[PDB]
Homo-oligomer: A and B are copies of this chain.
């Protein structure tokens, strides 16, 4: 646990400590600081910068932060955006609902939360004279655009009658706002679009596919696929997402959109079940007669990631170490 994390932290600081210290003593606010990516950014940066962490619930941000070996006292945790009086130089907006079920069960809320939080955070930044804001977005913004070498100018098309579009539509409008604040008020903004993050400190209560697999293998000595498992995507280790964001934080550029993916990790859902079954000594069963309306249709997509590689970033964590480090940290917690 301390093993896994400490290694990585030293790996990051070995390879990139140059860049990480272009934000020494920068005043940095992270929204959703309690979530998967939020935490690890907080973890990586709080020694080397003043960190403000905006979260839904301070107490569990405290539990979570010292589970991942953090220094409670080197971060200021707010629950209310308007109590943050200090001047922020960099905002990293990471807050959003993450579960597939919530997107189809509460599509209105999904939109309202994401839309309102984006609006508020943009107000805040422009009023607080922020130097840069980074907005986490999603590969789901590409919609019907399938296949390889998808570039940040490709544009998805979205039906207003498909409930599950709650999530992309919400991130789409947020992006549009983000770019519009940049062009109206010459405020530097970046949008970063993730595939799906994996790796240590993922929680067993997550229902995104990687953890549905790990958790089914452990708790039911079985992994069940509700589809044929032909969806093919790239994955990335959460620390590789953090580092990518850091490289983007250091860039002077009034506006840019960056895909974030590890292109070496391209694999199908089925192939992902198999690897995880092998690592956890379990078998893979199908069951294709359940309701799957929270899920996306079958597709394949690779993201052109030329921009983050041009900044000098590289991914440190292949699929194996990411899975192993993820699995190990779930065992070691329960």
Contacts and interface: CB of A to CB of B under 8 A. Distances in A.
A183 B257 CA distance: 34
A16 interface: no
A172 B111 CA distance: 12
A176 B166 contact: yes
Interface stretch (A7-15, A64-72, A155-163): A155-163
Interface string A171-199: 01101111111011000000100000000
B169 A172 contact: yes
B111 A177 contact: yes
Contacts of A166: 176, 180
A153 B169 CA distance: 17
A163 B183 contact: yes
A190 to B, nearest CB: 13
Contacts of A255: 161
Interface string A137-172: 000010100000000010111111101011001101
A263 to B, nearest CB: 23
A257 B159 CA distance: 12
Contact of A163 (B112, B165, B180): B180
Interface in A100-118: 107-108, 111-112, 115
A119 interface: yes
Contacts of A159: 153, 155
Nearest to A172: B160
A156 B158 CA distance: 8
Nearest to A141: B160
A75 B98 CA distance: 46
Chain A interface bracket (under 10, 10 to 19, 20 to 34, 35 or more): 35 or more
A119 B114 CA distance: 14
A108 B180 contact: yes
A162 to B, nearest CB: 9
Contacts of A179: 160-161, 163
Contacts of A172: 158, 160, 169
A118 to B, nearest CB: 10
A160 B181 CA distance: 12
A291 to B, nearest CB: 15
Contacts of A119: 108, 112
A166 B173 CA distance: 9
B157 A155 contact: yes
A175 B160 contact: yes
Given A115-B115, A157-B155, A169 B163 contact: no
Given A108-B177, A119-B112, A160 B155 contact: yes
B155 A176 contact: no
Given A165-B176, A173-B111, A155 B158 contact: yes
A250 to B, nearest CB: 22
Given A108-B177, A160-B191, 12 more contacts: A108-B119, A108-B181, A108-B184, A111-B180, A141-B160, A155-B157, A156-B157, A160-B176, A160-B178, A161-B257, A163-B180, A165-B176
Q: Which 9 A-B pairs have the closest CB atoms?
A: A157-B157, A160-B175, A160-B176, A107-B180, A161-B179, A155-B157, A173-B173, A108-B180, A155-B159
